[PDB]
Amino acid sequence: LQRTLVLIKPDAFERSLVAEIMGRIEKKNFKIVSMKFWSKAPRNLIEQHYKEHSEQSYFNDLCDFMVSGPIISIVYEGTDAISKIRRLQGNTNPLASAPGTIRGDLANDIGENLIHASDSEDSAVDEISIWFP
Template sequence: MEKTFFIIKPDGVRRGLVGEVLKRIEQRGLQLDRLELRTAPDESLIDKHYEALVDKDFYPNLRNYMTSGPLVVGVISGVEAISCWRAMMGATNPAQAQPGTIRGNFAQSPEKGKAIENIVHGSDSPESAEREIALWFS
């Protein structure tokens, strides 16, 4: 069994999509191991989470977006949970996300100069999953 970390981002919470996302996780046969609603996280936690991006020009908008309101964090497990969850999420850019994926069905293309509000996050490798789970659930 593989574990992965996920976030339902502030736009997903704000738009009332938490239940839909969790339903899809369970319907796919993945197990919810941990689940927490968090008030807007502080900037230092977001900076640690996105440490590889903090020097990018777009990062201040991403930080503002991720600290703009409550979010749901969790751990899911299952056979090939990382690749399964990433396929369920769809492409990062909503314009490229296939219909049927979470982002393809629900994410909206950003206004120029704003962060991509794409509903969900998922770890991209076993190493990232381990790091992100420890960071958010230490």
Template sequence: MSHHDERTFVMVKPDGVNRGLIGEVVSRFEDRGLQLVGAKFMQIDEELAHEHYGEHADKPFFDGLVEFITSDPVFAMVWEGADATRQVRAMVGETDPAESDPGTIRGDFGLDLGHNVIHASDHEDEGANEREIDLFFEEDELVDWTRSGTTWVYEDAE
């Protein structure tokens, strides 16, 4: 369990779902050696959207954000691994796809700031992960397991 010391929240947004990118996103995290511990294909309602984006409530773009995230289904996930949040953020790219490097999810698939395919917990926001995981998942929806083959993922694995 020592290698799976961090869980992080990730969500394919409605634009990514509509563009058929769920499998691509999952594959990239699996390829990286991260382990999926929870996933849910769901429709976000207005209440959940308001909770999720609460920090932006007073910003001019808030209503558009809520409208977009509730427009179609999302694919919410929890990934686990060493330094998972930072790893995922590096793979996701910058908030603005135009500033994201090729090879990142947003750099490869993002079209504009509003429709940037994916949400990932911020590694600089202490507690963001737990808050977002608790918002989207019940404790019993997360599976505690060890992927076989982790010997080949971490060099100091048993």
């Protein structure tokens, strides 16, 4: 029914949490449709991915972070996959992310937060085309 774009971020690799994160999505019965490993993502790709954040004070630090180690980009498929994976992901802010969520259990920074997931049907299409042209 729906396809969403997930990024396993460089901090997941540094902290050896790649399997842990992918395992939480896998156990929810979401199916991998496409996947790519990036040893270092091109900065331009990152900048496109986060285009809506270009005027934010953290934009450059964010881009630096996202190129600092490997990323895995994954297209997951399932009924209402976009909203469901967003709820598994958890809130951006470590003051709010709920225990039981990926970020709530594992992330302790607003920036180094392990995982990206598309937030809407519109943005899922855009992001899938970025990472899987």
